[PDB]
Amino acid sequence: EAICSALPTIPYHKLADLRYLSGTVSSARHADWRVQVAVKHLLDSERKDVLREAEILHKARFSYILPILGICNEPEFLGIVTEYMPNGSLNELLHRKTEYPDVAWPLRFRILHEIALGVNYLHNMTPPLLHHDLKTQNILLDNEFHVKIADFGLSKWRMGGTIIYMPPENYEPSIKHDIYSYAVITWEVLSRKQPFEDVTNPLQIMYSVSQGHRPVINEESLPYDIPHRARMISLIESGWAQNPDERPSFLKCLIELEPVLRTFEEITFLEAVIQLK
Amino acid sequence: EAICSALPTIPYHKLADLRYLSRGTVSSARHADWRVQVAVKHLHDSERKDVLREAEILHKARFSYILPILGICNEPEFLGIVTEYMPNGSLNELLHRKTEYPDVAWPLRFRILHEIALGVNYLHNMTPPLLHHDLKTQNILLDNEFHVKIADFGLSKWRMAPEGGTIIYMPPENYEPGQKSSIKHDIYSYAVITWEVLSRKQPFEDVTNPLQIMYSVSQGHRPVINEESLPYDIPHRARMISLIESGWAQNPDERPSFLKCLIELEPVLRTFEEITFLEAVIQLK
Ligand SMILES: [Ca+2]
Incomplete structure (x- = not known):
């Protein structure tokens, strides 16, 4: 009853149509899931920061907290993938x-x-x-x-x-x-x-x-x-x-x-x- | 390597204002600490493992169009699944x-x-x-x-037993x-x-x-x-x-x-x- 959920790993090639917005935030569309998503993405210890944040978002899931859809973790690229927010801030x-x-x-x-x-x-x-x-x-x-x-x-x-x-x-x-x-x-x-x-x-x-x-x-x-x-x-x-x-x-x-x-x-x-x- | 999220356990007594909705029985409630309305799906030790199975699936299948599970209510006197309340029904x-x-x-x-x-x-x-x-x-x-x-x-x-x-x-x-289905x-x-x-x-x-x-x-x-x-x-x-x-x-x-x-x-x-x-x-x- 120590029920655990794992944060999915998203392959960079799955993030189609990468576009710059405003860390660096980019929009994309997931090739398999067919939804628009947001991506936040050099260094070696700045990696521990990104993983730590992704872990916090994954653990703090709730109706009023930004939902995390997965982590894009590769030698080539490092990013946090979240639901796209169409109306900004x-x-x-x-x-x-x-x-x-x-x-x-x-x-x-x-x-x-x-x-x-x-x-x-x-x-x-x-x-x-x-x-x-x-x-x-x-x-x-x-x-x-x-x-x-x-x-x-x-x-x-x-x-x-x-x-x-x-x-x-x-x-x-x-x-x-x-x-x-x-x-x-x-x-x-x-x-x-x-x-x-x-x-x-x-x-x-x-x-x-x-x-x-x-x-x-x-x-x-x-x-x-x-x-x-x-x-x-x-x-x-x-x-x-x-x-x-x-x-x-x-x-x-x-x-x-x-x-x-x-x-x-x-x-x-x-x-x-x-x-x- | 893997990043894990644990499903919260919710004490029964934290569910205020329990009210019947459907007859698995569905009830509405408010969480005393979180201050949100919730939906509780519960029974009227083997029918118990069914609930834990479903709870685990909901927890693993989290996505934008899947009903969010907020926690599990697992006690000797009560067993149930707590999910976001859906104000517009089915x-x-x-x-x-x-x-x-x-x-x-x-x-x-x-x-x-x-x-x-x-x-x-x-x-x-x-x-x-x-x-x-x-x-x-x-x-x-x-x-x-x-x-x-x-x-x-x-x-x-x-x-x-078949429902x-x-x-x-x-x-x-x-x-x-069969085995194929x-x-x-x-x-x-x-x-x-x-x-x-x-x-x-x-x-x-x-x-x-x-x-x-x-x-x-x-x-x-x-x-x-x-x-x-x-x-x-x-x-x-x-x-x-x-x-x-x-x-x-x-x-x-x-x-x-x-x-x-x-x-x-x-x-x-x-x-x-x-x-x-x-x-x-x-x-x-
Ligand atoms: Ca009307």
Whole structure:
């Protein structure tokens, strides 16, 4: 009853129509399976990183985590093969305003709920998996804009880039990191703004955050028509609290979100999606 | 060399709000820690090994169009399989509840047929190949957006007491099972499913006795392919009938692989704009 599943090995010649996108991410189609897939692909110890990530994704399978379809492991080529995500990332949805002038509230709330469901699952694994690199860029959107959490490069078992989602206690090297990033994401989702807009240098962000400053909360950033505004602001504020001991577990955060999500009729989620490009 | 994923064990007491759905009994529940709805398939020490077998198959056969297993509930007082909850029921209910669903748009029907084929294809391409052997509309589950999840691997086999059920999806040569049964069982079932999807009709509707069906089918009778069952306005009608007729051939050897079916379906699906799938789902809500 120690039931085990093995991650399939995919021969490079099976990845037909390799095309560059944005590690290096490429799209392909599996020759036998007949599905479009995504491939993430020099060195000798950078191999251990890729295998480690592929193992994490394979072990963390869940409804809101990016599904891994297999590993392409050869002398010639090394890659992680995952389901293709046609709608990109949450970053693109919130910030490409001419492509997406309207992102209805029900869908924004659904995304916020699913992100939390995914991280909660990771934290409940045995032993707990901490993501440690959550950002709008790493929340992928499937064909119907359901969430798939990706990029397990910095993830850790509990046994240089953008710093806007990083809790201050991390600038001078915790189970309370993900919730902090989640709070910033929530603010970003509800405002459609870039956290710390007017800041020209990332060291100014790091300094400000270390002194307890946070993305701005007022009528311009978070308009009064936001459903359940006061309740969302409390969640955001508790999530990015300076003292990490005062930040909530994902359990508590889900218990708070559940009644908020019940106020949206199911069909409103579908209608929010159809309205998109 | 191999990277392994272990199936979680879920304590019975973590399943809150247990409610009966089907009578293997199917129940709904919410997981106390994960905060998601789930489906639980359980009994009302040898009927135990059957469950563990199916759980293992679901766990090994993970793919985009196969029902995800979330864990196994294995205790002295309770044994069951925990899977993702499918809010839109089965393909069977979508096709035959005509009052609830007066219209089921062609693009959605075709996407369903396409996704079933992708699912079975994936199984057939495993090492060693997995054969479902119990496909039916009742076992094609639908998620929130009506995407396919293939379920019920109870009779499935790795190619290396009797429970009462319909025989309509069973190929005639399986009526008295041998050692050879066979990679060509699934395609026969798919062919009947395809006919049932395009017609929204119960196969062998006229025949009241299940045993009579078995006679007819061995004698070569198939579900009726005429105008009343498959109207002329059906998108790509000729090409679908050709797919069906070859799929349920009396001789297993003439029946096509799923790969072949895919190749045939890929151009058909490209004739439907993305928007039409979303419209079809909104229409069903
Ligand atoms: Ca209706």
